[PDB]
Structure 1
Amino acid sequence: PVDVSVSIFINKIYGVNTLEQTYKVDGYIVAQWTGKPRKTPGDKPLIVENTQIERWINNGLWVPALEFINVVGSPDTGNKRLMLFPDGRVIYNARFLGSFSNDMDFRLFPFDRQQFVLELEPFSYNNQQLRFSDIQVYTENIDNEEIDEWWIRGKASTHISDIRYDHLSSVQPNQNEFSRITVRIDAVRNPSYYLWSFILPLGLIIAASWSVFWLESFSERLQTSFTLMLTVVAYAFYTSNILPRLPYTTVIDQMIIAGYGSIFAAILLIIFAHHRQANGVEDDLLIQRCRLAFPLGFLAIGCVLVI
């Protein structure tokens, strides 16, 4: 089991496709291992660049293919470097961009807190043939300055795990198990755009839904309420292209459903108020005085639907 030391320098994280739960990570990967000693020209290390490492591999030099488990497709790799040292150690540096996938949990879409996971593993060599000793992830080029769409909180957690595989049991009897590296970078979404553009107008429209009751006759109350639905429909088609589709309901969508329930509540109370006239002569006072009780009640409802 040859010892391999991995260093992952995360250049930048961007392109968080919330639709597909993918995110593009750019960076560098550096693998250090020690093999047989060899003769180099001088004591200078021998640097082999891209479109030239492949000739050394065809010659018989051992370069492992450290794949990414959670990647989409194949990483659009850039330059690659191979330093052969006269001491006997080999350093493989590479630049990678990749669309990585993760099980993002969108419980609170404005206020989300996920982790970007890079999962690195040897493709063919098991634990008895290649073992990852340690990884230090240099998340240093990543920095939040309150303009970034994701605040990257803290450092990056590194984990060296050992993973067995069911599908390699048929081809390998007892050694079908691979070493693996998990790099988790905890990030929180910047909620200020959604707070200042997609939530405050819901508050204004729901306040308007409270203020619709101030009219003293029923027909233009109905016309006002149908104008409102339209308004709520227009702003519901607004914010229909920013967020993914999940079984449970994200915060913007409870606000939209709360707006729908409000406008309808207005419908049912004005129809009931029109039908409180038992003989067509009794006025509407106790149910028409909901201009201060219904607003506070739906403030409580909205406080529930935010918490």
Structure 2
Amino acid sequence: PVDVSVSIFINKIYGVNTLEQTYKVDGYIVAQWTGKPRKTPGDKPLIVENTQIERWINNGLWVPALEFINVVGSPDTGNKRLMLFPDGRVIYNARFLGSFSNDMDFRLFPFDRQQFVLELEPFSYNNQQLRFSDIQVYTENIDNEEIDEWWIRKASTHISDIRYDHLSSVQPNQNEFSRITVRIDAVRNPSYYLWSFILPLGLIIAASWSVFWLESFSERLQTSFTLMLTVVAYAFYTSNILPRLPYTTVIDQMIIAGYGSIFAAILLIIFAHHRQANGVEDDLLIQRCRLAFPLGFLAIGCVLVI
């Protein structure tokens, strides 16, 4: 059972694709294992770079194929490099950039709690064990954060053994590969979305109610039609700029709320009026519920928070 020591260097985690639950990662992988000591020119460990590595494979030198279990597609390999030591051991170092997949829940969108994961695992070796895994999240925990879309926490390893129940034509016990699973926790930078989406959306819902502080009945009604046209014009601005998903976020709901608030008003207003014993018998208290559902909406809003 060959002992391999992996070292992942995260360089940048960017491009989150909300719909496909994808995110790009740029960094280097370093794998080290020991082989039958070798005679290296001069003596100081040998250095085989790009084109060359493929040659040394053709001459016997084995190099384990470490697949990235959760990569959509196939990584963009930069510089590959083999460092061969006289005492045997071999060190594989290569830079990569690939799109990884992972279950991502964007339900509370404006305020996300996501976790970026990597998953290394020998592509075709049952007993070729991954020794110790180390990740260098050489990123700035509290240096830059509000210049970047996401805020992090700290690296997180975890080696384990995966069992496939239908591998190759084997019975002895060939179905357990060791998988390195790295985890980086991150939280979304709310700022932008609050000050450009949540806030103004609130002032619209607020100023929505001020349709009651209108005297006439025609004014009280016809104005909610320009108010209706406003929430649509907003849901539009919201959708065209926000990340598409298969479910509704918090903002997606405030938009529905605004739609109900205005439809509610439409009913009351077209009720207070025609709930008359003469015609203009606008129920003085109902037509004046100017503080009834404006706060009765903090009751409908604190139920969406339950």
Distance 1:41 1:141, change over 3 A: farther
Deviation string 1:31-54 (CA, Å, 9 cap, x unpaired) is 010111010112211000011100
- Mapped partners of 1:236, 1:135: distance in 2: 42
**Unpaired stretches in structure 1, ≥5 consecutive residues:** none
**Aligned alpha-carbon RMSD (Å):** 2.2
- Mapped partners of 2:5, 2:136: distance in 1: 9
CA shift, 1:295, in A, is 1.1
Matches within 5 A, 1:159-174: 159-168=158-167, 174=173
- Mapped partners of 2:10, 2:173: distance in 1: 36
Report which stretch shifted further, 289-298 or 225-234.
289-298
CA shift, 1:293, in A, is 2.1
SS at match of 1:158: coil
Cα pair 1:24 1:98 within 8 Å, conserved: yes
- Mapped partners of 2:98, 2:239: distance in 1: 28
- Mapped partners of 1:237, 1:180: distance in 2: 45
TM-score (normalizing by structure 2): 0.93
SS at match of 1:231: helix
CA shift, 1:124, in A, is 0.5
- Mapped partners of 1:172, 1:77: distance in 2: 36
- Mapped partners of 2:129, 2:145: distance in 1: 44
Report which stretch shifted further, 168-177 or 155-164.
168-177
- Mapped partners of 1:91, 1:295: distance in 2: 67
Deviation string 1:185-238 (CA, Å, 9 cap, x unpaired) is 000000001100010111111111110111111222222111111110011011
1:67 matched to 2:67: yes
SS at match of 2:282: coil
Distance 1:225 1:173, change over 3 A: farther
CA shift, 1:245, in A, is 5.0
- Mapped partners of 2:134, 2:3: distance in 1: 9
- Mapped partners of 1:197, 1:46: distance in 2: 57
1:215 matched to 2:189: no
Cα pair 1:134 1:160 within 8 Å, conserved: no
CA shift, 1:269, in A, is 0.6
Report which stretch shifted further, 219-228 or 49-58.
219-228
CA shift, 1:247, in A, is 5.4
**Unpaired stretches in structure 2, ≥5 consecutive residues:** none
SS at match of 2:210: helix
CA shift, 1:130, in A, is 6.3
- Give the structure 1 partner of residue 145 of structure 2: 145
Cα pair 1:3 1:133 within 8 Å, conserved: no
1:83 matched to 2:83: yes
Deviation string 1:142-194 (CA, Å, 9 cap, x unpaired) is 964321100012x1110101111134155666312211011000000000011
Question: How many pairs does the alignment contain?
Answer: 306
Distance 1:20 1:58, change over 3 A: same
